[PDB]
Every structure is written in C-alpha cells, then in structure tokens.
Design a protein around this ligand. Sequence first.
Ligand SMILES: Nc1ncnc2c1ncn2[C@@H]1O[C@H](COP(=O)(O)OP(=O)(O)O)[C@@H](O)[C@H]1O
Lengths: 104, 139, 311
Amino acid sequence: MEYTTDIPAVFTDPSVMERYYYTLDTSWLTPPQLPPQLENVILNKYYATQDQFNENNSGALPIPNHVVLNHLVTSSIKHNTLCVASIVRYKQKYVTQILYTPIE
Amino acid sequence: STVSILPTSLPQIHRANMLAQGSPAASKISPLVTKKSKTRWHFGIRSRSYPLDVMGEIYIALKNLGAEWAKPSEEDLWTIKLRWKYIPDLMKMVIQLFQIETNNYLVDFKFDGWESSTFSAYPFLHLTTKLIMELAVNS
Amino acid sequence: SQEKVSIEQQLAVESIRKFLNSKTSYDVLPVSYRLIVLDTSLLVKKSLNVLLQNSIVSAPLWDSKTSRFAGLLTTTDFINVIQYYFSNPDKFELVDKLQLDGLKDIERALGVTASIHPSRPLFEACLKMLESRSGRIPLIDQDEETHREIVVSVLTQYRILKFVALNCRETHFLKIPIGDLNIITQDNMKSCQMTTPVIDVIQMLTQGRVSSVPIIDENGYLINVYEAYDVLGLIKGGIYNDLSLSVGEALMRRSDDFEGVYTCTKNDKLSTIMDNIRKARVHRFFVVDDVGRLVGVLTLSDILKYILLGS
Ligand SMILES: Nc1ncnc2c1ncn2[C@@H]1O[C@H](COP(=O)(O)OP(=O)(O)O)[C@@H](O)[C@H]1O
C-alpha cells in the first residue's frame, strides 16, 4: 500500500461524492451498521462478570469475543483525565490494558 | 483455632472507645468515603454529525498530528488505514465508521501492528488519547 | 502422634514445593483480568483517587515521552512524600501540582526493582520477592514486534499463597503449631501507643521497613495496628492537619469497610492460616498470648519463606 498526507477528495470536494450518487445503478455510500459485538451493553456485561467473580464469587471469569480485541475502549472525561483501554491477548489469557492520562 | 479478628481494630469499636475517652476527634473526624461509581465503558467515540462531516474531521485531526493514510477505494470509504510515527517505528491503525442509529455514529479505533500473543497497547492508547483530544479541540 | 504430625507436615510442604516448582507465574494469572497503568504526567492526587476508586494499592507507570514503563506506584511512594511534606510545610501548596514523575524525582533526590518473566517457575518468583523484600513483583515480557519490555501484571505474595491454598488440599496437613516452627518474628518488634503522633508511626514504617506497626497499650495488650495502606486515606482528605494527629485520631479516617486486624496464637497451625488466606485478604497475623498481649507477627513473607526454605 501507498501512504500519503492527502485527505481523500471524497471528504474535501463535494464533486466526488456527488459523482458517486449520480452514477448509481448502494451500501457503499452509507457507513455499515454497528456490529452486535461492539455494543456497550455487551462490553459492560463483560466488565460486570469480572467484578461478580472477583468481589462476589459468582459465575466464572468471562472470555471476550475475539472480534473486539485491539479495539479502543473509552469512557467520559472525569477531572480532566481520559481513561482509555483495550482488551488484548496475552498468550491464552486476556488483559484489559487500561491507561489514565491527563488531558486539558 | 485461635485465629480471630481483633474487635478493637474495627472502626466502629475504635471510634466508640475514642468517644468514651472524650477525644474531640471522635465526633469531628469522619471515615473516608470513596464513591466507587461504576463507569459506563464504550468502544471508540460517538458523534451526532453525519458521515462525510465526521470522516473529514478525523482526517483533519490525523493530518495535524502527523499521520499518513492509504487511499480508500469506493468500496471502503468509511475505513481509514493509517500509519503513525510515535526496530519497527511506524504504528498501524484502522479507523472504522459505524452507524448506530439514524443521527448517531460510532468511530472505531483498532491497533493493527507496527511497520519499518505478547504486546503492549499503551503506545496505541496514548496516540488515540492525542487523537480524541484533537477531535475535541476542533469542535 | 508427634512423629505422625511431623511427617505429614513434611509431606505437605514437599508437595507444595513441587507445586510451586511445576507452575509458572503465568499460571497464577486469571483467564481474563484488568491492568491499570498511569501516565507519569498524572497528578499524584488524581493517581491516589484512581487507586482508591478501583480498589487497588499499586499500579505500573507509563512514560509516554519515551514509550517505556517507569516502575510502580505503591504505598511506599506516598509514605515518602508525607515525610517530605511534613519536614517542609512550606511546600504544601505544591501537593495540588505534583505529578507522578515529579514524585519519583523527589524520592530519587532524597535517596529514598525486582521483576520476573511469566514462563519462569512460581518458586523463582517467590524467591525473588523474598530477596527484594517486597510483597509484589511485576510480570515482565517483551513486545513481540517492538521488543520493548512490558508489564503483563503484578503478582503479590498474597495472590501466590491464595493460589497455593486454592489448588493444594495438602495445606490441611500442616498441623504443626507455628510456635514450634521458628517462623514468627518476635524480636525487636516495632510498636506504638494510641497517643504516639501518627508522623512518628509513619517514620517507623520507613525506618523499620515494615508494612504495619502494632498499637499496644501500657500493659502490652494489642489494641490495633497502623498500616502503610492507612497513609492513603490520610492524604486523600486534608494533608495539612491530619499529619499532626495522634495515631488514635488518624485512625478515625479508616473507612467503615476496614476488614480488621487478624490475630492468632503460637498454638495455631499453618493449615488454619492457609484456610484464612484462602477465604479472606489477610496480609499478616499478629501473634498474641493467652490474654491478648503482643508476642510477635507472622507475615506473608514469613509463611512463604518457610514453605520455600523451611525453618
Ligand atoms: N511491626 C513490626 N516489627 C518488627 N518486625 C516486623 C513488623 N512487621 C513485620 N515485621 C517483620 O518484618 C518482615 C517484613 O515485614 P512486612 O513488610 O510487614 O511483611 P511482608 O514483607 O510479608 O509484607 C517479616 O519478617 C515480618 O515478620
């Protein structure tokens, strides 16, 4: 692949997308629907199942869906601090790597 | 078994004994209360702006931060295949736009390796923090 | 009877040692778990909140400028900054401004770290913890693409002893009274009274290099304990006046969910001790006599050393 710092014309020039919309003969022109695996209910259930095991001895530690691995996890800025995470594989185990960074 | 919890070590009994002694601190100094509030986590970030608008802002932020990206074809317009500097030195990311609802969009960020089982997401986490902030500043 | 108790203790320990030799640090890791890391530019006060909010006493630090890990934030870091701030009350306006990297600078300036690979035997992880005289050890590996060393997790003496207890029923056969094992530390106990200023107790923590100071009364009866961990609640509120309180008063800051001090006697057995470690987060057992007078302390390092090396 070739790489450059030129923002694709489709996002800077109204003529490009117009061209696509007029030369129709469909889903390309709209971004895809959110996959079920990326919904927050599933992500926070995963978090709660870990908490239920470690604090209440209920159930068993959850295995994350492989499709969400290496994806950015975020939360609301609190006290000028951004907390981001990514669920990543370590050998056969799964670490949610969490970073606290100051912002402004 | 003669293994026990020392009753005088419990805060309720310690406070009560200090009160009985007459010490002023017993009434005045309150236990630490840590409000362990449950955070709602999400993948990526949400925007109410529309696809071309959102994609434009990301590319803009990407450009100012010093990233480079591949040319997207007509079949993958809502996917940014980017590379970023920060021994393999160039970090690869895939940014993907999704539609949640009619007026609601989710920006997805994915670590995709390095270019010239066991890995740290922290460099990726830090750069995305830069990117998210740059996106906030521009709005 | 005595010979039976003895050989059974010997069989149990030899079995536990084989277990420790056969498992790795990687094995102790839960199948899915979270790792909280703090950027070195984060404020100390905010970092303290992150610890307390997330129910942890430690976190690896990340230097974003150099893409390298920069050691661990622990209660010791907070102990050291308290003594600095107390001896220099003029600097108190800078608490609000102090960043984690700044904190590490202050400690380095005042002249005030072990690691292991997950693949190495758990036995070796325990030895290294005893050698470093710490209750925790970072698990380190190399990033497979960048070859930068990375923190996979941090293991504690507690987690290892609990891991042993959860997997080895042999612990039940450790029936020799601990007083017959010469594993209790009885000599030169650092202790205090309720009227001891808390700053002096905090000094004892650093000077003695212990995690806790037992509080006794005039007759030697054990009443309470002040722990390194307690210093975190001391800072959280209002550093200014809290540092000047007596230990009795500073203890009023303890959260109501404080689990309590654990005690035992010399007639107690490691089987019991291990059952307690299994069911609860206990970090030490203060040894008292028949009437509740302090005679010593049995810590996780004392228990681990016995298991690894004997009496
Ligand atoms: N208050 C104290 N006075 C004297 N010795 C102590 C005290 N507390 C702990 N010790 C001993 O010092 C060593 C290390 O103590 P500590 O740091 O509290 O335990 P650990 O290293 O297991 O966390 C152990 O041998 C323990 O028995």
